[PDB]
Amino acid sequence: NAPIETDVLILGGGPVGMALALDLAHRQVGHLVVDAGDITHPKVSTIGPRSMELFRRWGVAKQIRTAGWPGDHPLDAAWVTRVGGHEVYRIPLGTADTRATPEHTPEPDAICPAHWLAPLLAEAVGERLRTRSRLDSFEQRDDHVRATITDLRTGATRAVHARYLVACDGASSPTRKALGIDAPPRHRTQVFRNILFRAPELRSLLGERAALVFFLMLSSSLRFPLRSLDGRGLYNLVVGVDDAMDSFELVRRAVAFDTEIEVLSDSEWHLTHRVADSFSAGRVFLTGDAAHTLSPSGGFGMNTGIGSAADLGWKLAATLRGWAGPGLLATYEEERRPVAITSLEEANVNLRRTMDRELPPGLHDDGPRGERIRAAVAEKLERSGARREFDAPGIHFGHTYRSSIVCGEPWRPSARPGARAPHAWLTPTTSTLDLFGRGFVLLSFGTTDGVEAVTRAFADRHVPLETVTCHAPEIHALYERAHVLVRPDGHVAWRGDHLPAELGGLVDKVRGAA
Ligand SMILES: O=C1N[C@H](C(=O)O)c2c1c1c3ccccc3[nH]c1c1[nH]c3ccccc3c21
Numbered sequence: 001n002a003p004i005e006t007d008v009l010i011l012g013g014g015p016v017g018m019a020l021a022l023d024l025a026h027r028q029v030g031h032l033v034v035d036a037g038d039i040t041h042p043k044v045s046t047i048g049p050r051s052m053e054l055f056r057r058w059g060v061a062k063q064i065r066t067a068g069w070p071g072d073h074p075l076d077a078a079w080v081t082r083v084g085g086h087e088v089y090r091i092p093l094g095t096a097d098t099r100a101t102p103e104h105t106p107e108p109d110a111i112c113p114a115h116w117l118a119p120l121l122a123e124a125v126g127e128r129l130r131t132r133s134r135l136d137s138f139e140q141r142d143d144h145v146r147a148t149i150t151d152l153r154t155g156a157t158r159a160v161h162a163r164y165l166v167a168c169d170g171a172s173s174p175t176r177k178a179l180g181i182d183a184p185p186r187h188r189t190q191v192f193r194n195i196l197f198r199a200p201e202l203r204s205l206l207g208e209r210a211a212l213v214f215f216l217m218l219s220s221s222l223r224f225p226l227r228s229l230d231g232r233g234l235y236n237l238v239v240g241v242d243d244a245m246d247s248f249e250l251v252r253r254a255v256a257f258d259t260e261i262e263v264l265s266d267s268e269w270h271l272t273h274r275v276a277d278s279f280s281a282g283r284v285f286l287t288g289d290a291a292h293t294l295s296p297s298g299g300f301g302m303n304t305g306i307g308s309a310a311d312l313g314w315k316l317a318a319t320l321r322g323w324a325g326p327g328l329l330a331t332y333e334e335e336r337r338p339v340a341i342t343s344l345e346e347a348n349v350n351l352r353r354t355m356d357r358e359l360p361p362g363l364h365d366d367g368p369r370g371e372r373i374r375a376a377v378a379e380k381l382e383r384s385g386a387r388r389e390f391d392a393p394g395i396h397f398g399h400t401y402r403s404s405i406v407c408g409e410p411w412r413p414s415a416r417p418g419a420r421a422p423h424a425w426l427t428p429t430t431s432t433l434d435l436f437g438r439g440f441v442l443l444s445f446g447t448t449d450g451v452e453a454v455t456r457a458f459a460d461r462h463v464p465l466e467t468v469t470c471h472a473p474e475i476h477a478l479y480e481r482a483h484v485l486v487r488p489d490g491h492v493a494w495r496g497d498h499l500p501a502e503l504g505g506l507v508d509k510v511r512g513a514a
Pocket residue numbers: 042043044045046192224225238296297298299300351354389390
């Protein structure tokens with residue numbers, strides 16, 4: 001009959017669309033997610049420690065850890081000639097259960113394939129997720145956007161009113177194409193096949209030699225990962241496709257065992273390096289793949305999209321509540337593009353590592369001449385810095401925003417402006433991270449002078465703000481300055497042992513007004 005009314009219309013029900021939905025939900029912003037219900041892309045099971053911190057904010061981290069990934073399954077990354085052949089190099093990474101509890105984060109990375117993450121994110125989001133719904137089209141108006149969604153379950157079509165429209169329609173984003181925004185390739189496009197197969201006993205056979213992922217060194221086409229998706233029988237084999245040999249043949253090539261193998265799917269997927277020239281066109285925005293696609297080498301892809309959705313999340317709400325400066329939305333691209341590009345390059349440095357590593361003559365050679373050749377590689381491989389692909393704390397946490405709303409100061413955790421406020425335990429159950437996520441938060445160590453001042457400045461502009469006084473010195477040390485200001489996203493916006501005189505000039509700068 002009449003149009004639907006919501007502030008933010010999310011296009012794309014994948015992890016990123018859901019993340020934006022969860023954060024917006026926690027900021028009390030009315031939204032609606034439409035997913036055609038009907039994405040040829042890498043497989044993607046890992047969730048970085050930074051994304052796990054965001055899900056902690058949203059109360060779903062636990063559900064993700066108990067989703068189904070077995071706790072006694074290895075997390076090792078192993079380089080081999082074949083899965084069951086000679087092992088060349090290995091990075092022990094323990095199991096989910098028994099492993100060193102991280103010191104720089106309260107939430108270590110996690111495993112949760114799509115056939116588990118999807119239902120999770122769906123329930124956490126609830127009714128505001130309209131599955132099996134297709135966007136017919138969208139027209140942009142002066143103060144809002146108008147779309148048309150067809151309920152693919154009933155056939156009915158419905159018009160939707162919305163202050164803003166955010167698209168997460170993947171790397172092929174129609175919305176981006178429609179907005180006439182381009183995303184030229186930052187690096188060469190390669191082709192790969194994702195062979196999903198089931199090996200009921202593959203794990204039993206391997207035993208202690210199992211691994212979250214196996215890097216193959218068997219051929220030009222078979223020198224790519226073989227991952228345990230659910231550590232319960234499901235596996236994915238990546239194989240390189242020259243520019244242009246059978247599914248079951250290949251899998252049987254990768255695995256040295258004579259055990260039951262059932263191929264479930266075998267599909268192509270382009271590996272691309274594309275960052276959109278723009279992240280928005282007026283009232284329509286772009287997140288995740290639609291704005292920045294990278295190589296899955298390092299799992300930076302999804303974390304950068306979830307990291308971007310969260311940034312757009314509090315900037316959308318702020319403009320909606322009316323307290324952000326008219327220039328704050330513009331900062332989404334100003335801060336998130338450079339991160340996407342930095343993560344893109346590093347992902348590429350991991351991809352290159354694998355492509356350039358030429359494979360020796362008698363590598364899969366048995367007995368010593370071979371044991372020695374393989375030993376050789378195990379060293380050059382480590383010399384090439386393989387571990388970087390799995391231990392990259394600088395990509396997960398190390399991203400400092402240099403922008404018009406961070407009073408900048410001209411790996412190891414820093415409370416440096418534009419950076420993510422470091423982790424520290426205030427109590428064995430509450431991390432400092434747990435204070436960030438709502439509105440601005442002012443931290444003070446020892447002193448409390450000048451706080452009544454800021455409290456009012458922010459209050460002058462309705463800018464939500466919380467002030468916390470902390471005491472232990474370890475944290476005070478870690479954060480350095482006496483007064484640290486954290487944005488709704490948990491990144492430092494300013495710090496110093498003394499609050500500057502005209503606070504209005506400050507509040508206005510951080511909210512993106514002046
Ligand atoms: O397809 C993938 N799927 C994996 C993914 O989902 O990113 C993946 C994939 C590939 C991958 C695929 C082709 C060539 C090199 C590659 N490195 C990787 C990866 N390196 C990682 C490090 C940590 C976590 C995941 C990966 C990874």
